[PDB]
Design a protein around this ligand. Structure first.
Ligand SMILES: [Mg+2]
Ligand SMILES: [Zn+2]
Lengths: 43, 290, 193, 48, 1116, 87, 77, 151
């Protein structure tokens, strides 16, 4: 901890941060109560 | 019930005053005087009456009664609280900062009448609201002061320079004598002399010593009119401010340690009595912006 | 117009979580909640010394649960740690005796809510006392601006050796006689004495 | 012109390009920081 | 006659008017809303008596306001003629017990008529359950007694404002019409020497364009308005002319982006104002507008007309022109002047009836929209009133009001006075009104109009100071919504026994005298000089026969709560306010005792409060018992009253009800048969009266702390029951059903010792923290046994089972004897919410005795925490050996400016020991002899009305003549002080001490509720810091000023642990607990979690917040 | 939340681990090793009997008997008083 | 037998500063605390209480007693 | 002098007494920046707030380089503006206006050096004031040889 550099986040940086891509608005199936595939909360 | 003894002369003085008041009302009924002039003369008349009855009560009460013992000692209370407990309350503020023409003539021992109680509540509720708002404003002021005053820590033992600040050690010197300043404590005490002082060819107060009662008294007796006290304003320190310029801390009585957060303490001290202030103009006087 | 969502209230936003009185900056980074703490109404204790504060048995026991458990395990009052926890939860006499033994020579920082100036937090020597209200020395009251109409004062526990060192040396109640505003006594109130 | 110079020079000296103004990919908060926690009673609790 | 127990009266003036029904405000408003038998009986009684009253009820008025819906063809119509009720299916106790809203059905006859069919079809429809109000002014919704508080608002009408602008150096005037429902309008004059109009404040515009857009022509405009030069200047500077041009101009300014259309603009102007639906001005709005503008009998109900707009324009210029008296347009001469909004003639209370009516109105408007859509999407001959009307909006709005609304407030049943004061409060905060942020100095401040219409003394002392206030004692509500107060009539200087009710505006014109003014033996005034009050709150006197009204009772200005305090006149306003706020928290005790000294009005407050159980028939009691009392009227009807016994109130206090009447005593209608909480013989009793001596005492009573005997703990003088209610629900989850059983898993055998057969704690089983109340077990869970657990189980051969304990346990720090348990089973006939198979509630009741820390207070704003309870012998005792039950610091009364408590103490002493005055021939003796309070036996209570109390001469003279208690000697010296022997050291105190009896109350700020502690407990989810509150083991907050104060000390390490180790660091907390337990030194703190949350969030706004080191990347 | 590791449970489990390891060390080296493998006190996956009987060089049944003897010895009142309180 | 039992003036003049005294007594308290919890390794570098100690004691109290006695010395690196 | 006297007489009107150093430190904080004028040789903008130290350093640099110094006039601004216009954006961000500072800091791409207090309370590190200083915290402890000789 010496300096908290801040700046504009370019598209390349946001892609680098991401561990995947979100393609659906699904959150959790109404029965199994588990996170869905490729949506929000996806494991 | 017998501890609070209302002055005996009160009834006679107040009936004399009300006789004069009804004379003025009679001479107003004929139009000889404008209503505003009536209000002004009446307000002055009743201010004089309440001051005089306060003096009469102050003379009346003995030194041995409990209220005198617990007000004179500094235990609690104030003389005006006893004034409105024993003597008549006096003029009370009307809503939106006005004054009533018929001030409360009764003390809390005798008991206020109905309209008197109502017109007192008029000011009481305003006082409570003012207290709440002043508390909030003081809190916000303290936050702002603490934020702007952060990052100023003592990070040097002694300053690299010698420049100082001129302060009035003694003022209001009557003819043929020297009188010290009335508020010498908050200004020059707990400060640090930048350089020695010589008045009779001999050093009186050495350099870099804290000022107390004995030193200030001796310097005033020697007759010096000013003094050059080192202060943070003129401090020339490469890193923050030095301990020497700031002078002794006030909670310890000793030279401020290196690394002490002086800015936070300064902001807290400034903002602490913000709730206690609660001062406001008694009356606008009918003029805005003056 | 904002994105009202349900219609009752505007929705929270990424920037809204980073802004305002309830934002992260001023509510979860500069002022945080803390474990090992307590709160209770305050009563006046005149028989105390300037460096003492009375902690009810329940509050003292709950604050010092780890230390009480360690002392119980060391003195063989409880067989193992879990038995010690069961015993302290039950609240037997030996638990309170161990508590009386363990609290001593360990400072606790009494603190009132407004904390206008640095004397708002003052370390004290705890002392077990019956009842459920904190006993506080009348002299140090006026520094807290703490009357006894009805008032709650938070008690915080310095854990590390450094923390209790500071509380013993710096934040002590007896080393703060003078008010920092103008360097005059503040630890000699005037109501009764 | 003073304000324009201030911002233009601030962008010139910094290595980051001005195109960061127009984002192309929107980051997503980690799910635990926007919890859809199970709540007793068959109900649910969600962040906006 | 026998209404109330005897109470010696010190009042000096007789009261013509008796105090009205203290709860009329709620019950009569709801009767009007319902339009039941009571409201129409009242209406016809007023009509035959000549008194005005609205002849149309609330529900029927709102139904009739909705005209039959007409489609685009106008062929069809629905008529809602008559509405009716049926008796409620659930009894009040039944609804309270089983969690049902106390409601009744409401039907209405809908008639279907179509011109094309030429037939009329009638059919009754039912719109849902209507939440009904019990006779005691409370809505029992979902088992919880709610109360709807009246709301202060600005009544609709015109309001003119005068202001000064520093830049302009001249006065600025503005006008505003405030509608009841529609969009608002303002008319500013000489903003910059020209007059303008604010049409929704959309854009800058002149007055000339508006007038031209109307049919009024320029010639007649200047003819009428040619006498004022300013508006002539406005006219001539206006270049545009012609109605069409002005209309299209204003339309373009209002709705730019499209070309102007004549018909569309005219329809828009008609819609925004002249439409009767959008601009529905209430009856009060028209009523006050016709008076203010002076128009003589305009349309009784309707929208503003062009005549009204021109009249307002005229009035505005007359006010600006400086003329103070001018002819009103189409009206008589009227004073033109600026009006202040805060005047109580401009403030209107929305009683419960009007609030519920507004909610019903919006529900019915939604219903009308839905049915109109259905007509637009339905075929003829298949349309009937049953199928078309959708009842969801009405029920869902009247249900969304009583829940989730500021005005429908949770009842506080701390005591009957708290209930009354909650009923009578006028909450200015709420929807469509003065909010907390919108508060200013003026609104909170008292006004001269608040005299008999609002109590100035009592109000919340918190941030909402003055915004909420209790209605005056004698206040009554105008049908329009204003507040009246009674006044006695005066004619040729003779006071008549006739009463007229005056509102806030009718009062201004006349001159009102003061009730405390003396009167002669004859009905004429004794003294020519009489104090009066006049317009503007002036207090100038007017001697002789000049007044016309005077106050009927000196306690008009004080509400019910403030009127309780004795010797209120001697107390400061601030302390009186604090005492009034404090009296609404005294808890009922095991045994209640009525005050020895107090107002004469506690009986009315107690009886009008619903807690007391009074008889409805004049009969003889036949069976008296603890559970119930039976009475038999002479007619033959038998009625038995069931007395509630130890049932939890809203705040968690017992509501035990005692019994007074004997077996064979006679009863009169309305007589009190059973007390309630904080009551005795029908008299309010919020506390016990303790012998008090004023002295500092070894520092225990320092800074208002209180010292009291161990007698109070020993004799249960100050002891109260406190019943807690916590419940669990055996819900059904995905894995399986949770089971309430005695076979709890992973437990010992002795924990489940007192449980019943099905796993419920028995009745009467004392519990403590951790004791099992009801045993419940989770269905199952995916259990992956850990290696250590596996080995331990195998060694011990115990089978860990999927079922997991979730039993209810008493929260930490609790004790009490269980008194009752209730079970509701799904499979049984009982109904439950979805999912919950079984629900169990357990009542745990404890007899909390007074102890150190518990808050105590008196009536006069003197409050303190108990600091020590010395034994009976340590108390400084009196000469006869009677210890003083409480020591109070003398330092308080002079500084607090509340010497009324000293007067109360002296009068309590005088009441305790009777007095005998006969033939003394003294002035005070004469006053007592004519009053009748001359011979008083020991112990009898005394009544000192709030502003007609006992004069100090009376108290002194009585103290001279107290009955000799023992050995023919009086213990209290003439000065009111007595000899006090020190209990501990023994020697007498050097000087006498003031002693007497004070009425002390036990507040609800008990130390048991406040005490909270936390080694380590639950943590929050989104941020890993500890969560707050006491119910969830919450750590205290270390605010910003705390960290500032710690920085001021320079203590960095204590801060570092107080921010990292003790919260917000997940890795650090387990490590520090482990180190403390193992004795190892505390480990180095890590980084906090909230900082990680912050950096992750700011990374989500496209700000690449990178933590870097001096030498390249940093290690974290 | 439910995921937060209760410090009381964590420290109790660590003390349980220490006590269990010490009690196993009290037993003979081979016996402690085989029972630990049978119950995965070193690794999260316990090895069934014949799977213990590969690295140690003993049969699927010899390992069974010595595991049974270890269980019997641990069930002795000696090495049970400390572990009983931990459940 | 109290927190004030070692008066602050002697320690302060021994260490010449107040924060320095806090940190130095804290370091010594940590050292004695980690000594008392050795439980058998017997590292040569660790040093136990120089002054006499009770059967149950706080490490910081013994550290401050050592500072007051003066037999302990410090040296900034 | 004017500021100190005004605020002191405001406080003394009621009866409270605050020492003058507490005011003086804040008054020095307000007067810290200087408005630059005639920014010819210094090459930066004219008429914007600049810290005294930065102005002195730039003047020394330019006079050493031979260019005539850029003039400046002292400027007094309220505490709020002074706090907002601080080098550490992580402290200004913690202050009242979070959004604006974050936008301008991001555009400027300024790295927040952790010197200061409010930023070191956020990170959870040790504040550099009091026991958290470097000089106090680097000391090592060991008894004397005679103490070991005795025991
Ligand atoms: Mg308080
Ligand atoms: Zn310096």
């Amino acid at each position: 901890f010496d300096e908290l550099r801040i700046g504009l986040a370019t598209a390349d940086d946001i892609r680098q941060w991401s561990h995947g891509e979100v393609k659906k608005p699904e959150t959790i199936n109404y029965r199994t109560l588990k996170p869905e595939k490729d949506g929000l909360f996806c494991e | 019930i017998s501890d609070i003894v209302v002055p005996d002369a009160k009834k006679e003085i107040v009936k004399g005053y009300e006789g004069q008041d009804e004379k003025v009302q009679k001479q107003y009924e004929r139009g000889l005087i404008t209503k505003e002039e009536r209000t002004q003369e009446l307000i002055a008349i009743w201010t004089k009456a309440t001051n005089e009855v306060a003096e009469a009560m102050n003379d009346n009460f003995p030194k041995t009664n409990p209220v005198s013992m617990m007000v004179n000692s500094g235990a609690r209370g104030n003389m005006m609280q006893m004034r409105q407990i024993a003597g008549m309350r006096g003029l009370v503020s009307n809503a939106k900062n006005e004054t009533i023409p018929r001030p409360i003539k009764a003390s809390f021992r005798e008991g206020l009448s109905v309209l008197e109680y109502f017109i007192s509540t008029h000011g009481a509720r305003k006082g409570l609201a003012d207290t709440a708002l002043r508390t909030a404003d003081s809190g916000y002021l303290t936050r702002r002061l603490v934020d702007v005053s952060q990052d100023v820590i003592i990070r040097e033992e002694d300053c690299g320079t010698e420049r100082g600040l001129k302060l009035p050690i003694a003022t209001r010197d009557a003819d043929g004598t020297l009188r010290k300043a009335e508020d010498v404590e908050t200004s020059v005490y707990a400060r640090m002399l930048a350089e020695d002082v010589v008045i009779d060819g001999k050093v009186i107060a050495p350099a870099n010593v804290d000022l107390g009662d004995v030193l200030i008294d001796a310097l005033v007796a020697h007759g010096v009119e000013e003094v050059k006290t080192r202060s943070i304003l003129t401090c020339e320190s490469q890193v923050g401010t030095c301990a020497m310029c700031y002078g002794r801390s006030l909670a310890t009585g000793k030279l401020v340690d290196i690394g002490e957060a002086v800015g936070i303490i300064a902001a807290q001290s400034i903002g602490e009595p913000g709730t206690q202030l609660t001062m406001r103009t008694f009356h606008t006087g009918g003029v805005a912006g003056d | 117009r904002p994105v009202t969502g349900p219609g009752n209230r505007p929705l929270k936003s990424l920037s809204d979580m980073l802004k305002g009185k309830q934002g992260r900056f001023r509510q979860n980074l500069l002022g945080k909640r803390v474990d090992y703490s307590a709160r209770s109404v305050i009563v006046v204790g005149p028989q105390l010394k300037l460096h003492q504060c009375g902690l009810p048995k329940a509050m003292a026991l709950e604050l010092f649960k780890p230390f009480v458990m360690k002392r119980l395990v060391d003195l063989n009052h409880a067989q193992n740690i879990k038995s010690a926890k069961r015993m302290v939860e039950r609240g037997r006499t030996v638990v309170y005796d161990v508590l009386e033994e363990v609290i001593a020579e360990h400072p606790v920082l009494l603190n009132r809510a407004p904390t206008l100036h640095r004397l708002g937090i003052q370390a004290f020597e705890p002392q077990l006392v019956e009842g459920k209200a904190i006993q506080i020395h009348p002299l140090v009251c006026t520094a807290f601006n703490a009357d006894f109409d009805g008032d709650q004062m938070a008690v915080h526990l310095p854990l590390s050796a450094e923390a209790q060192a500071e509380a013993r040396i710096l934040m002590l109640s007896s080393n703060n006689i003078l008010k920092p505003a103008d360097g005059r006594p503040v630890t000699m109130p005037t109501q009764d004495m | 012109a003073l304000k324009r110079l201030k911002v233009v020079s601030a962008f010139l000296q910094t290595s980051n390009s001005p195109k960061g103004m127009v984002l192309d990919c929107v980051p997503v908060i980690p799910p635990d920081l926007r919890p859809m926690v199970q709540l007793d009673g068959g109900r649910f609790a969600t962040s906006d | 006659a026998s209404t109330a127990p005897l109470r010696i009266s010190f009042a000096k003036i007789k009261e013509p008017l008796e105090v009205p029904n203290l709860l009329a405000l709620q019950t009569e408003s709801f009767d009007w809303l319902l339009g039941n038998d009571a409201w129409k009986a009242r209406v016809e009684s007023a009509l035959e008596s000549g008194q005005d009253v609205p002849t149309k009820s609330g529900l029927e008025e709102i139904f009739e306001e909705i005209s039959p819906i007409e489609d685009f063809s106008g062929s069809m119509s629905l008529t809602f003629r008559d509405h009716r009720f049926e008796p409620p299916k659930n009894s009040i106790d039944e609804c309270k017990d089983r969690d049902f809203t106390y409601a009744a059905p409401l039907f209405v006859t809908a008639e279907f008529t179509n011109n094309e069919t030429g037939e009329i079809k009638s059919q009754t429809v039912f719109m849902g359950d209507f939440p009904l109000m019990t006779n005691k002014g409370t809505f029992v919704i979902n088992g919880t007694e709610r109360v709807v508080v009246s709301q202060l608002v600005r009544s609709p009408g015109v309001y003119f404002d005068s202001s000064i602008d520093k830049t302009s150096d001249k006065d600025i005037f503005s006008a505003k019409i405030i509608p009841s429902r529609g969009a608002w309008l303002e008319m500013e004059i000489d903003k910059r020497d020209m007059v303008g109009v604010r049409i929704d404040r959309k854009r800058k515009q002149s007055v000339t364009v508006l007038l031209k857009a109307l049919g009024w022509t320029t010639e007649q405009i200047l003819e009428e308005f040619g006498e004022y030069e300013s508006m002539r200047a406005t006219l001539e500077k206006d270049h545009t002319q012609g109605q069409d041009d002005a209309l299209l101009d204003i339309y373009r300014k209002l709705r730019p982006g499209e070309p102007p259309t004549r018909e569309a603009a005219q329809t828009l102007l008609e819609n925004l104002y002249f439409n009767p639906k959008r601009y529905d001005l209430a009856k009060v709005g028209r009523y006050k507008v016709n008076k203010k503008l002076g128009a003589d009998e305009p349309l009784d109900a309707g929208v503003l007309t062009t005549d009204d707009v021109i009249a307002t324009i005229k009035y505005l210029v007359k006010l600006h022109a400086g003329e103070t008296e001018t002819v009103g347009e189409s009206g008589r001469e009227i004073v033109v002047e600026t009006d202040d909004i805060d005047h109580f003639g401009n403030r209107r209370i929305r009683n419960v009836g009007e609030l519920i009516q507004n909610q019903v109105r919006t529900g019915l408007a939604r219903m009308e929209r839905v049915v109109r859509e259905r007509m637009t999407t339905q075929d003829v001959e298949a349309i009937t009133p049953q199928t078309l009307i959708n009842i969801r909006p009405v029920v869902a709005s009247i249900k969304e009001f009583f829940g989730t609304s500021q005005l429908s407030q949770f009842m506080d049943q701390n005591n009957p006075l708290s209930g009354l004061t909650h009923k009578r409060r006028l909450n200015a905060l709420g929807p469509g009104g003065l909010s907390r942020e919108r508060a200013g100095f003026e609104v909170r401040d008292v006004h001269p109009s608040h005299y008999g219409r609002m109590c100035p003394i009592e109000t919340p002392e918190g941030p909402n100071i003055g915004l909420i206030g209790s209605l005056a004692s004698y206040g009554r509500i105008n049908p329009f919504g204003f507040i009246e107060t009674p006044y006695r009539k005066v004619v040729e200087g003779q006071v008549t026994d006739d009463v007229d009710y005056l509102t806030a505006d009718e009062e201004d014109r006349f001159v009102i005298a003061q009730a405390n003014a003396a009167l002669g033996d004859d009905m004429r005034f004794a003294e020519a000089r009489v104090l009066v009050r006049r317009r503007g709150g002036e207090v100038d006197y007017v001697p002789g026969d000049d007044v016309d009204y005077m106050d009927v009772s000196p306690r008009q200005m004080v509400s019910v709560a403030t009127a309780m305090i004795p010797f209120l006149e001697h107390d400061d306003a601030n302390r009186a306010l604090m005492g009034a706020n404090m009296m609404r928290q005294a808890v009922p005790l095991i045994k209640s005792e009525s005050p020895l000294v107090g107002t004469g009005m506690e009986y009315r407050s107690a009886a009008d409060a619903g807690d007391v159980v009074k008889a409805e028939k004049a009969g003889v009691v036949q069976e008296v018992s603890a559970d119930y009392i039976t009475t038999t009227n002479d007619d033959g009807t038998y009625i038995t009253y069931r007395l509630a016994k130890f049932s939890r109130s809203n705040q968690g206090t017992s509501v035990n009800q005692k019994v007074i009447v004997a077996e064979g005593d006679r009863i009169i209608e309305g007589q009190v048969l059973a007390d309630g909480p904080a009551t005795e013989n029908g008299e309010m009793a919020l506390g016990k009266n303790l012998l008090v001596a004023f002295m500092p005492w070894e520092g225990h009573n320092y800074e208002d702390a209180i010292i009291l005997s161990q007698r109070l703990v020993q004799d249960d003088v100050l002891s109260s029951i406190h019943i807690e209610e916590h419940e669990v629900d055996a819900r059904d989850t995905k894995l399986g059903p949770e089971e309430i059983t005695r076979d709890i898993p992973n437990v010992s055998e002795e924990v489940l010792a007192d449980l019943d057969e099905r796993g419920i704690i028995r009745i009467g089983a004392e519990v403590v923290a951790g004791d099992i109340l009801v045993g419940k077990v989770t269905p199952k869970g995916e259990t992956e046994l850990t290696p250590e657990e596996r080995l331990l189980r195998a060694i011990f051969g115990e089978k860990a089972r999927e079922v997991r304990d979730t039993s209810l346990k008493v929260p930490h720090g609790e004790i009490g004897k269980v008194i009752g348990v209730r079970v509701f089973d799904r499979e049984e006939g009982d109904e439950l919410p979805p999912g919950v198979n079984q629900l169990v509630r357990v009542y745990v009741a404890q007899k909390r005795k007074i102890t150190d820390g518990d808050k105590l207070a008196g009536r006069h704003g003197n409050k303190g925490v108990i600091s020590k309870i010395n034994p009976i012998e340590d108390m400084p005792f009196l000469e006869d050996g009677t210890p003083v039950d409480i020591i109070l610091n003398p330092l308080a009364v002079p500084s607090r400016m509340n010497p009324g408590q000293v007067l109360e103490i002296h009068l309590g002493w005088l009441a305790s020991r009777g007095w005998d005055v006969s033939g003394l021939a003294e002035e005070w003796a004469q006053r007592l002899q004519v009053i009748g309070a001359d011979k008083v036996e020991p112990g009898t209570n005394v009544a000192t009305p709030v502003f007609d109390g006992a004069r100090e001469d009376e108290l002194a003279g009585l103290l001279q003549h107290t009955i000799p208690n023992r050995d023919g000697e009086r213990m209290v010296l003439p000065s009111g002080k007595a000899r006090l022997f020190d209990g501990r050291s023994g020697e007498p105190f050097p000087e006498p001490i003031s002693v007497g009896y004070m009425y002390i109350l036990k507040l609800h700020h008990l130390v048991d509720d406040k005490l909270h502690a936390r080694s380590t407990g639950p943590y929050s989810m989104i941020t890993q810091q500890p969560l707050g509150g006491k119910a969830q083991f919450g750590g205290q907050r270390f605010g910003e000023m705390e960290v500032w104060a710690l920085e001021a000390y320079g203590a960095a390490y204590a801060l570092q642990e107080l921010l990292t180790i003790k919260s917000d660091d997940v890795t650090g907390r387990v490590k520090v607990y482990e180190a403390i337990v193992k004795g190892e030194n505390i480990p180095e703190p890590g980084i906090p979690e909230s900082f990680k949350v912050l950096i992750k969030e700011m990374q989500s706004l496209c700000l690449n917040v990178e933590v870097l080191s001096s030498d390249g990347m940093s290690i974290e | 939340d439910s995921e937060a590791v209760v410090p009381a449970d964590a420290v109790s489990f660590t003390l349980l681990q220490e006590q269990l390891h010490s009690v196993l060390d009290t037993l003979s080296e081979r016996e402690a090793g085989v029972v630990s493998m049978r119950f995965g006190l070193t690794d999260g996956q316990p090895k069934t009997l014949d799977e213990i009987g590969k690295v140690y060089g003993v049969t699927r049944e010899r390992i069974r008997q010595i595991e049974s003897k270890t269980m019997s010895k641990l069930r002795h009142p000696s090495r049970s008083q400390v572990l009983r309180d931990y459940l | 037998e109290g927190i004030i039992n070692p008066p602050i003036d002697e320690l302060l003049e021994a260490t010449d500063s107040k924060y320095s005294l806090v940190i130095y007594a804290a370091k010594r308290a940590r050292q004695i605390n980690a000594y008392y919890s050795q439980l058998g390794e017997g590292l040569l570098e660790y040093v136990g209480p120089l002054v006499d100690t009770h059967v149950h004691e706080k490490p910081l109290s013994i550290a401050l007693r050592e500072i007051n006695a003066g037999l302990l010395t410090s040296e900034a690196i | 002098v004017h500021l100190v006297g005004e605020v002191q007489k405001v406080y003394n009107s009621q009866g409270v007494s605050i020492h003058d150093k507490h005011i003086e430190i804040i008054i020095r904080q307000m007067l810290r920046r200087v408005t630059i004028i005639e920014s010819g040789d210094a090459e930066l903008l004219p008429g914007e707030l600049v810290e005294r130290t930065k102005f002195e350093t730039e003047n020394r640099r330019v006079v050493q380089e031979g260019g005539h110094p850029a003039s400046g006039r002292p400027q007094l601004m309220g505490i709020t503006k002074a706090s907002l216009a601080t080098e550490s954006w992580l402290s200004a961000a913690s202050f009242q206006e979070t959004t604006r500072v974050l936008t301008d800091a991001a555009i400027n791409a300024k790295s927040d050096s952790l010197i200061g207090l409010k930023e070191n309370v956020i990170i959870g590190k040790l504040i550099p004031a009091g026991t958290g200083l470097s000089r106090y915290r680097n000391i090592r402890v060991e008894p004397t040889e005679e103490a070991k000789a005795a025991m």
